[PDB]
Amino acid sequence: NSNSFAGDSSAKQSNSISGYITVEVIEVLANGNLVIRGEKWMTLNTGDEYIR
Amino acid sequence: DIITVTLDETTSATKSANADLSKTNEAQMDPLQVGGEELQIGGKYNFSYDLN
Structure with missing residues (x-):
């Protein structure tokens, strides 16, 4: 016999603002x-x- | 009245903007085999699919 499983999930988020x-x-x-x-x-x- | 003007002007302006969107799907399953034979749902349907 040979059973196998693999499961993954991911997420990512970023932001930036620069000014006046x-x-x-x-x-x-x-x-x-x-x-x-x-x-x-x-x-x-x-x-x-x-810009508001 | 006489007034002398020194012409010294230098203006510079830049702007930029860009956007991206991306999405992908890839789901594949080989026909399920249980008991040495290929399982059938209904009369002609396998346990398999393919999405891309």
């Missing part, structure tokens, strides 16, 4: 925390990119 974005305060909370929001648009040659 300047936003503004849109709301002040009860404890003093600041809700922020803003967008930034750049048209370099052709096509518009945005």
Whole structure:
């Protein structure tokens, strides 16, 4: 006789962003925390990119 | 009034973006043999498959 089994699984995920974005305060909370929001648009040659 | 301007301009802008998607499947099974004979389901179907 000869019986054999092998089973595996895998997964992987990563991301990164680098840059700057300047936003503004849109709301002040009860404890003093600041809700922020803003967008930034750049048209370099052709096509518009945005950061939000 | 006369004012002298030194022309010294240098602008440079680059942008890039790319995306990838890939998926593959490969499932294969030889016809099952039990008791020295090839098992049959229904009347003409084996225990085998092939996906790619």
